Amino acid sequence: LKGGDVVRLFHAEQEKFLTCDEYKGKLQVFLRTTLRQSATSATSSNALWEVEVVHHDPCRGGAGHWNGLYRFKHLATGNYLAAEENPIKYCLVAVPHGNDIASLFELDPTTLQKTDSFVPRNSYVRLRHLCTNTWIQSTNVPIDIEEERPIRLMLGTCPTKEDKEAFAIVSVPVSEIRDLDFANDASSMLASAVEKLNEGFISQNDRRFVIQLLEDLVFFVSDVPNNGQNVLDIMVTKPNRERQKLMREQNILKQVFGILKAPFRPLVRLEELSDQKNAPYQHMFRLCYRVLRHSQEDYRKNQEHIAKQFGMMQSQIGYDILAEDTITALLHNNRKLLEKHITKTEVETFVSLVRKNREPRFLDYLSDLCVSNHIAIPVTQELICKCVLDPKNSDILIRTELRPVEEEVWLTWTDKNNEHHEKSVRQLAQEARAGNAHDENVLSYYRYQLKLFARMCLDRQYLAIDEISQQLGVDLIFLCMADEMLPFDLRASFCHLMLHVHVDRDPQELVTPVKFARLWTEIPTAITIKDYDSNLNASRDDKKNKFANTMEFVEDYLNNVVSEAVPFANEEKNKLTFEVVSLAHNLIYFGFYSFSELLRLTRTLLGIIDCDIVVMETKLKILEILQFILNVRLDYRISYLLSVFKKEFVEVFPMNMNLDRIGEQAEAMFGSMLEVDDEGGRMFLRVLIHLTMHDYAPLVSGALQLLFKHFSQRQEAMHTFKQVQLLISAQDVENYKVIKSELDRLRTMVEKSELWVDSENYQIVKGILERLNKMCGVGEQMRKKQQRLLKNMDAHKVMLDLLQIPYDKGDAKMMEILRYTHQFLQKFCAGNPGNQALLHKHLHLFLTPGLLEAETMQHIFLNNYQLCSEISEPVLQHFVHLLATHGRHVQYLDFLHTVIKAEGKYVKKCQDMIMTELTNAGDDVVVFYNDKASLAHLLDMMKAARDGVEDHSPLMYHISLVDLLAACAEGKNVYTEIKCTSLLPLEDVVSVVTHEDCITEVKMAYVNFVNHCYVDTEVEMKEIYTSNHIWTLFENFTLDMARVCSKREKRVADPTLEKYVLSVVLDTINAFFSSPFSENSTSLQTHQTIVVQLLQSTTRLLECPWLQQQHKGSVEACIRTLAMVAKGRAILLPMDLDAHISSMLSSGASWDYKNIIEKLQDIITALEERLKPLVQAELSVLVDVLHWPELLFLEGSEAYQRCESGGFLSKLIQHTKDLMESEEKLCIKVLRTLQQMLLKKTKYGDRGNQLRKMLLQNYLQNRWSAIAATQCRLDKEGATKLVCDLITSTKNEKIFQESIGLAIHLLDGGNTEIQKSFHNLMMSDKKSERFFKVLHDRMKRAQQETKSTVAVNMGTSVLIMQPILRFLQLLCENHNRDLQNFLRCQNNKTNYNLVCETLQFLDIMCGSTTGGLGLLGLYINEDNVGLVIQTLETLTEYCQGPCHENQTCIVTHESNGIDIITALILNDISPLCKYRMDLVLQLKDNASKLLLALMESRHDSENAERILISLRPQELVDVIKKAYLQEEERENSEVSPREVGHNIYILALQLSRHNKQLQHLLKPV
């Protein structure tokens, strides 16, 4: 560290960054809080700090020493950090000048330092203020409490020193400093311009200088080298988020806003902008607006800062300032901001201005405003509709008509002069071809008006769809789109309108291609494609009656496109083909096209996309179409197999099956006619491979998904069949029919939401919901059957849409309908994890600020440990934020209570997050009555509710809060137990308990609190056993038991009181008396009478006949513990009561539905068994295709060259890297496929081999060494870099595991090229530290978990070790000295010793000191024997070569792993050898190998004596002799005890050179 260098100070405990900012006009220093998930990423320019050194010469900075005074300066404000009297005694603030001792500071090192050596950068230090001799500290008191959710935190000083107040230094790149300085200069120039504007006098040259400033700022913001384009029209491909944030914090946006506002405040006027005098001012406003547009691109914070000014841009609209385009961009960026900004006056202004200009371009602004992210916004849509469809704006809308004149289309428009002109469309198009400017202008205006109508009608806006449909008929639209004279763009507009108005309408409904649940009677005996399509042919024809000719047009147009030599030669036709393909996709998904027609169309589509944003989108849509056709084919296959099953069942049982006969037809089905393409699959697969190469990410993802699915047809169909459901019983058939009808009606009503929202529709929907509630049924098994039926029906999506329906809080009828819907969802999710998964998929909608949907979410999360594991901190945060904002009722707490527990299992992480959030929120969310006055208020409410407690009472809210807190206490969790102890004192608990009259439920809650937070403490609490709160609680408990018994004697008793006692009091008493901590209680001699009375109360409780049998047994166990405690606590029992206690001790010592189902299940199982090998046979074909993609493409093509160069594989690897974060499943699939490619070839049996031969012959034309060649090819293509990047950056366990597996497979065989590539990557790359740190951290976590399980008595952390150790062994295989030395010393800034980590792992696994003592038999079991063997092999690989440094490290490590290594040989491993002796022999052999490798080539004796110290020669000789004799008892196995003994003998011979006794013993008779 040197003076004049800028760095950042970071707090470890607080995980926050110090900063200085002008909160309310005054500069203040604070520890800003960050809501990000990565503290290191919370870096701001204003948080930069500079270090200044104090020297004798004021101009001399030099380099700071550990004993030199230091000062902290702000790189932006320039003020210096200092401490001043706090109105904590001193508070940190910023001063303008450093000419005072206050700014002086010193850095106390946290660790040892090299005397007065220069301070190293990025070293922990503690700030100390020498001016007043006070130590800096951190506090949670905010400085900006005035604002909700404060971020600024106070940093005071303490007279004493605290070791936790350590600040870490972080370096800063020169780029940040340069950007900050340039931004400051630009801000100064902008301030000068603002001063000129405020003065109202500015020279022409000065204004030109301002324009030049704006141009330079435009260049800087664009970040694109200037190419001569206008700054106003500058184009930026991607903005820089850091630069935008720098501008925002510098307030350059504020400067621009002031520059725009001040002239109109005048120096300039909006009307006067037309004047040449104010033309340069208008140009400067335009520059400001373009700069704002570039600044706010893709930045929500900048968008919010602009929204703060939304008023001024709204006023600026209607003037030549590009406000329209800027506002449209900003509004399209975010939908919520659009909902805030949009207003009816703004819509009217847009209509008025577009009318004023009579230009097409205005309409585009409204068109873009209508939709965002291509997703419609109902409010803006309706607002635009209301203004557009009004007759007043009929002038702007060009009316069109069809007249015979066989038919012709005419257009009438109105000019600004009000003159009306009407012309034929065909004549207008011909005049356009001629080139008339007016005709072109009217055509463009017409096109933009149709585009605006289409965007208005987007997402089924029936409020305005009707009028537009009436104005433009289907026949008119088809005539227009069929007309050839019309330009391609206008035809495309007509096609888009046709798609978005008529085709997408109520009569049409999205059809799910695959139906899981079918009826047995429905199944046809004989099935063909025609029979399959006959199921809904009548409905298809009925719907076709309206749009029949359009399908003919689309089919013919696609035939023409495929016939065309070059598909995408012309862009004007590219637009039209995009529109036509989109229309085809919508028609297909609406189901107009039959299965045979879809198969016919697949050929044309694949030809079109078989050998530009529009082209890429067209290809993507065609891929989606193909996916739909393939899934329809899957459904057809399922139906055919079901038909075969029906035929066989009918034959056998008219009222022994030929399973082989069924299986033959099943195999034949998979295989002909079903094939999408004529070639037989080659066309499709080639299309997919070619698409994978293209740049577009969604296109590549879809191509890869289709390619993977194409080679897994059989397994998917088998899964679908196993999930098929059959209806055979009349009751369930009737239920299915009723559900279908009700769902159809409900879907229609939801679709016409717009019409029936505000009627009879309300009552109809309420009746439908009641019928559904009755339909859901009762009975657990009946419930699961009905849930399966409902999931098959797919009504969940309909109900989710019903919830999505918009509404106003005033509609109580719609509230009741929502309650019915929530009950329906509850019944769907009632004890069904499968259904709950579907709900979690769409949970994003469920996250709303409402009690009823919160309860529904609770019921969704009920009993799902998978969902608890995958829970999200942001979701929990938003829940606690809901509590903080409102905290109205207990349902919020009940949700958290449900989340806490799952399957009677504890998740420590969620509990910790809940406790932390509760503490951070503080008294606002947590309300406690600890204070006497608050307890008095609680007493008042308790007395009011003494007769009864209301279901929404604040008393019950407090009780629920207490229960929630105790639930977090469950689990003997020390970390949260400390917080609970801080939260609530036993003295408050005793006060409230000892109150004369208390609520029974409150008492249960507090006893539960005691049971969890205090009794179940992991760490002994001294206050518990040094305090009398527990004895006061026990006397109260005994009084309560006496009350319960007297009540039952009186025949009048309170179930709440009885439940309180039985449940909480008994458990607390038993836990206390069985507590190991309480075994040393020394006040029991004083409370002898109290404890004896408690035991008497328990005796009476057991004597009571009313006590339940389960309660009786639990009480008997508790009383056994009570007596065991009572033996020696200075308590003498009465004679009769002692006899009764002895009796207690004695007691403690004392057509066929089911036939059809079974037949189907047996057939499914037989088919699965038969087709098991063919699945792998098909899968292997994908590996062969990936190995040889070029054979697919005709030789001599450009694709052939690219494939031969390995381009396809490299693109696959790079795309895997790019998509690891977005499509984790596809990333994992690609990684596993790469592993399969690397793996050795394996035979698949006779049938599998035949299938593979046929598949390869059809797909391809015909055109350890192999493993090494494949490994080298993958390394060249970039597999090594992909693996390194994944291992460094992935946060997914599956991704990490697959990456490590790919590494192991690549390195298999000790490939020197792969090892050298890994070494080069690690050494050259800057992420070597990240890679090694990830591996070392995983190893350390596994070691910690291993210690935990050893203490307890096998964990993903341990299981992940095997691949990591294998990877390290393979890296060091073949005695690679470079790698072996690198692992020990990476020579990086932080060096992690993987060798010592492995040795420590072995030590902890074997038991460390106890293992050395010789408890290896107990410590090692069958499960971990493989891991121990792998660790020993890895250590041997490290040692061999020989690596002298590694050998010395292992022998001299402080863990004494050598002791365990030798103990392994000597110890018998008795528990294991009895059952699995071969593993013990292998362990001993590996240990001997490691010991020999340790002294491979060490001439010195140091290692020999170190080994001999633990390994006495006599034991070694006895082991060798024992092994030789045990040879005879050998059983069949690869390991040989004679070989093990020979290796041990060789080790003994090597050791004997330094030991005379060993030599003498080894000498034979």
Ligand SMILES: O=P(O)(O)O[C@@H]1[C@H](O)[C@H](O)[C@@H](OP(=O)(O)O)[C@H](OP(=O)(O)O)[C@H]1O
């Ligand atoms: O990823 P998102 O949705 O944008 O949210 C980010 C983050 O969650 C915070 O809102 C904010 O950090 P602070 O809380 O530290 O302000 C940050 O802005 P920033 O770049 O101004 O920090 C955001 O970008």
